[PDB]
Symmetry: C2
Subunit: 565 residues, 2 copies
């Protein structure tokens, strides 16, 4: 049929895989988790976990995507038994969109707040918000006595605006009674999905042309933000809050399980977008240096983002003598509540707010485009009938996403948003990457993987990467899954408590993605006629190796394959 | 490909088309609408409207289904412009299922109430029901003083059981706050859809074998019910309430618009099931006598059902000296509230309740099976790929119906149930039958229809049926649509009032089916390359007549075709 739509240049692929990993400052609280674990003695464990998690997994994803020349759905053509997981990493990705674009819509709403001269968070006098008239006191404008305020003060103008005008949480008591979607967030999501459709309908060319412009803004924005911070007096102390070096605070099973999830969610390994991007890349490329550069760029971006956030926190603590630890809202909209107020204190709040919201929209749109392109490529390579009708398929996917994201744009959508995000992302993606690592290291074998790499690359991976693929990565993923399952805490908002049935609904939604593996295994086992040893052979051997099944030449049954290093 | 799955015998087709039109006593209040219009001077207008509406439309549906040999989706192969409506009558049917099976589930629940020795409606002492403890007084067990009771008494044991144990309406204040689906109705709907899947997955053979047994029960049940009624003393007066002959009460625009909808909803003309059943019938059949027999059977069934209901009402009025007019609940579950209590007064309530619930389940399952088979046949004849995979398609349809019927099986589902039923059924089916009649009488022409009939039948329809098809039926349908649109009243429950946004949601849902015609017309007009006169010709001429389009031989453009009688 039609050949693969190769990228115009390697720079487009590089910028795309970079912009896919800049969502660390969107909704993820990186500096909060950094300060939570060992205070400032977090850099070394962070780097160690980042390496051992991403680099082997990123190299594996890139190599399996480039060599197989197909989407993540059929990327398991060498082992159909695990091919079911190829579906999982697709559907899970869609689940992410179900909330992700919603967050983007929130940022878009902030754009409509930045077009005016008087920002809504500057004045609490019913400026595009409906306060409860309980304590409408400016945190900086109205200077009053400093009190503990029950160690929780959610009456700040920015938080009030975010909760009343953006979320309308006051008209929703919980998750049992939700309500109706907001007309503003609905139009914002419509604009977002229309942009995504007009970008993805053509192919990878428009995607590259968009990420070539969108991914170049956050660097300049973070640079000018760090400059404006270091020019402010209250940043220095904030720096002291960023890295409070305490090697003795590294408690057992405290700093590791909280650092293994943030890097895993920020890098995006096993999410299915890497295979989709590698499927359109040239067959002759160096995934090693590209993966190293991507990991280093992601680490530097996380570091500078945490530094900027802690500088903003230090300047805010300089603005009001109350402590910044228990006064901030460590929720989904942490960047939407604390950061705008600082912009109110900075001169020329309009331009800074506009450029910050543009950076947020760009870094969200890039990740959403990548996540949707992964699903598109997977379902196109799986079903060839949908390969030619790319525009109609993209329109249908966007329409289904808009219809199924209404539960997240409503008044009480943030609760279901956090529920879906946490449960689905954590559980499903962890189980999927665990199954992928197992299938690649034990069933397919790292020897054939290294041979394919050496055939398509100028060198062969040494013993280090092979051991990391075989024994380090699967054991690490299994440990993370065991910690997430055993040490499971019931989900709860900052103040709101989730009902018991919500936890079971979240567990069912998360398990709906992981049960696709045994169902597909049973389907493949039943769709093959013959003896058990022949069905297992057809399931463990690649398609083009099926002729060996009649010859009874299977290396997986040999003990030398399981112990092959 | 595979030929048409012809029925085993004509008796199967007859029993199927009969059992499809026995849903008049399920949720439809036939005797209430009879007594509302002219009291007892309803038989003559009822018969006139029944004839003029069904017989021409039923003959047209049967002939168009038998001659075209295809489902309702592609039955417009002679005129693709109206082919869009072929989709409408499909989707609308599914909408009906979205509530219809739910009602069936209710009846199934009553079966679980009839298996016990002590019926729940007999004793109000918390017998499988949670009363509000306001007025737990037996209507017949506790003899008290007769009062007006504010002209509305909804505290009867049967109504209390139906509202608390079956619906759980007390935990739902309205439609803005719905809640969670009930676990009993969920399992009932699961059983219903599993039976529908195990019946429809094979084809028309199992459908005929099921309707050959299910459609034979309601006759015996109605016979024994009429016998037990005429043996009761209080039936005679009830008969006087059934037919109170008053020719002077036939007010203008009062008895016609209320009788034109009941017959139209009971007969089922234009619903799409008739074409689906005729598509599997032999090419040589007499649709005239079959349609006449079907109409006569439906009329006799409606008459005997109204007689039985009014006899039950008269016996209930004999049980308690209070009037039966304003004490009954004229809602969806009228047969579920008033009729069981009478069974409590009859000796051996167990057997009578069991056989009545079995009759209800059979007459609901037959109609649901027909409505789903219509959609199956339409989407199979439209997309040939789904023709071979009939079992998987039926499973998917049943699963989607079960997933989309959760809003009707919940605590507040009855409000959305009535909303969807009324809006969708009335508006969409009326617009669909109007468009079908117009396309058959004016665009295709009654002359070619009569010629095809004479080719496939032993005689040609006279001037009467041709005039009824051309000038009577379209004008009648247009008048009914105009009355429904202009004389539109806001929907409201017996006591609950619907919010304003619910009316707009219902209007949008109803219009979503009717907008499929202009969209499909525009799609067909844009999918044809050429001049406007050639596109119109391709849109109005049949497919096999497309060769005439190049010859510029189009009879529709001639004035003799529009005036052809």
């Amino acid at each position: 049929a039609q050949p693969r739509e190769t990228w115009g240049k390697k720079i487009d692929f590089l910028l795309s895989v970079v912009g896919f990993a800049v969502d660390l400052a969107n909704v993820w609280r990186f500096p909060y988790l950094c300060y939570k674990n060992g205070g400032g003695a977090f850099l070394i464990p962070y780097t160690l976990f980042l390496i051992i998690a991403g680099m082997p997994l990123f190299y594996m994803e890139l190599a399996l995507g480039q060599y197989n020349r197909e989407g993540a759905a059929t990327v398991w053509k060498i082992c159909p038994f695990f091919k079911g997981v190829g579906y999982a990493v697709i559907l899970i990705a869609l689940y992410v969109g179900f909330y992700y674009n919603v967050i983007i819509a929130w940022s878009l709403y902030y754009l409509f707040s930045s077009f005016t001269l008087n920002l809504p968070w500057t004045d609490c006098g019913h400026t595009w918000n409906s306060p409860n008239c309980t304590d409408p006191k400016l945190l900086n404008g109205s200077v009053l006595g400093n009190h503990t305020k029950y160690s929780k003060y959610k009456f700040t103008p920015a938080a009030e605006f975010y909760e009343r005008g953006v979320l309308h949480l006051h008209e929703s008591s919980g998750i049992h009674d939700i309500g109706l979607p907001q007309w503003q967030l609905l139009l914002c999501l419509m604009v977002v999905v229309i942009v995504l459709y007009f970008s993805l309908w053509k192919g990878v060319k428009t995607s590259g042309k968009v990420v070539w412009i969108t991914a170049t803004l956050p660097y300049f924005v973070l640079f000018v933000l760090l400059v404006h911070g270091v020019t402010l007096p209250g940043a220095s102390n904030g720096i002291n809050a960023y890295l409070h070096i305490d090697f003795y605070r590294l408690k057992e099973a405290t700093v590791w399980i909280d650092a293994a999830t943030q890097i895993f969610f920020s890098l995006g390994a096993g999410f299915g977008v890497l295979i989709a991007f590698a499927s359109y890349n040239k067959f002759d490329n160096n995934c090693y240096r590209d993966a190293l550069l991507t990991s280093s760029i992601n680490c530097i971006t996380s570091f500078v983002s945490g530094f900027a956030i802690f500088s903003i926190l230090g300047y805010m603590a300089h603005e009001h003598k109350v402590n910044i630890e228990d006064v901030a809202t460590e929720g989904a909209g942490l960047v939407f509540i604390l950061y705008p107020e600082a912009i109110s204190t900075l001169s020329g709040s309009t331009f800074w707010a506009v450029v910050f919201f543009v950076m947020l929209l760009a870094l969200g749109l890039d990740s959403s485009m990548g996540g949707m392109e992964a699903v598109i490529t997977g379902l196109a390579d799986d079903f060839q009938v949908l390969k030619r009708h790319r525009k109609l398929f993209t329109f249908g996917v966007t329409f289904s996403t808009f219809l199924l994201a209404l539960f997240c744009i409503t008044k009480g959508g943030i609760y279901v948003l956090t529920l879906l995000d946490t449960f689905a992302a954590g559980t499903s993606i962890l189980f999927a990457v665990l199954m992928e690592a197992i299938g690649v290291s034990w069933f397919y074998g790292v020897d054939r993987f290294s041979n394919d790499i050496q055939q398509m690359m100028g060198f062969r991976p040494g013993l280090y990467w092979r051991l990391c693929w075989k024994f380090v990565s699967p054991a690490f993923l299994l440990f993370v899954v065991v910690v997430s399952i055993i040490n499971f805490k019931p989900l709860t908002y900052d103040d709101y408590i989730f009902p018991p049935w919500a936890n079971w609904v979240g567990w069912g939604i998360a398990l709906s993605s992981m049960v696709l593996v045994p169902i597909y295994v049973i389907y493949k086992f039943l769709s093959t006629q013959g003896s058990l040893w022949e069905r297992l052979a057809y399931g463990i051997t690649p398609e083009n190796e099926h002729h060996l099944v009649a010859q009874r030449d299977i290396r997986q049954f040999q003990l030398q394959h399981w112990l092959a290093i």
